[PDB]
Design a protein around this ligand. Structure first.
Ligand SMILES: *C/C=C(C)/C=C/C=C(C)/C=C/C1=C(C)CCCC1(C)C
Length: 225
């Protein structure tokens, strides 16, 4: 057992409770719109959980040579994010009745963001790793921009209950998402300042808040109906 296993086991559990809790709740609703929010928001933690459980069994980890040592890299995150991040975005988009072309672009951006962050994490030349990280972040700030400006202004043209739920969900997403690039920069994938075990703790906290925490705020609100 690697020092960080405690945090993988604790994400596993929390994603697990979150997935089943949402599954149940959503299975009892008959409203066709609420069902759609549920399927999507249940699928996120579902994908998370199977990927955290994978990591807890020691898969999804490779050694990458850079700055003269063998650094450990949990590529399994990216497998998870790749599919979970668009899923969250989609929620926000359904919520504000956003245009088809906005969604494609956001997903577009998102693929870019995760794609590059991964290549970042696998690059053997130390310098270049930061070239990818900076592209990934650029792609991300593009996303947040559109959420904050684009989506909010769409939210205005909906009921107060829907708009004010979006805002909460918007704020939560802007706080968590903007932590990730910093964690990566200071963690084992970047500067190797914060060790792997603490890096995992921070990602789990962010992973869980952003899927269990989000789902809970969204799924309890009248605005899904
Ligand atoms: C459920 C998982 C969520 C909601 C994760 C979001 C992850 C990001 C917003 C990742 C951003 C990254 C950068 C901005 C550059 C560095 C590497 C990435 C993946 C960590």
């Amino acid at each position: 057992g690697r020092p960080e296993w405690i945090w993988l086991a604790l994400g596993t559990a929390l994603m697990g409770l979150g997935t089943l809790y949402f599954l149940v709740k959503g299975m009892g609703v008959s409203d066709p719109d609420a069902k759609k929010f549920y399927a999507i928001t249940t699928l996120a933690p579902a994908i998370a959980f199977t990927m955290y459980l994978s990591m807890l069994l020691g898969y999804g980890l490779t050694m990458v040579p850079f700055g003269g040592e063998q650094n450990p890299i949990y590529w399994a995150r990216y497998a998870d994010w790749l599919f979970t991040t668009p899923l969250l975005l989609l929620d926000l988009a359904l919520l504000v009745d956003a245009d088809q072309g906005t969604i494609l672009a956001l997903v577009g951006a998102d693929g870019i963001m995760i794609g590059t962050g991964l290549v970042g994490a696998l690059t053997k030349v130390y310098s270049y790793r930061f070239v990818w990280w900076a592209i990934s972040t650029a792609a991300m700030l593009y996303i947040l921009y559109v959420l904050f400006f684009g989506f909010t202004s769409k939210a205005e043209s909906m009921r107060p209950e829907v708009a004010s739920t979006f805002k909460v969900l918007r704020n939560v997403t802007v706080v968590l998402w903007s932590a990730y690039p910093v964690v990566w920069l200071i963690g084992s994938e970047g500067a190797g300042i914060v060790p792997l075990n603490i890096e995992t703790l921070l990602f789990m906290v962010l992973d869980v808040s952003a899927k269990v925490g989000f789902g809970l705020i969204l799924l309890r609100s009248r605005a899904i109906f």
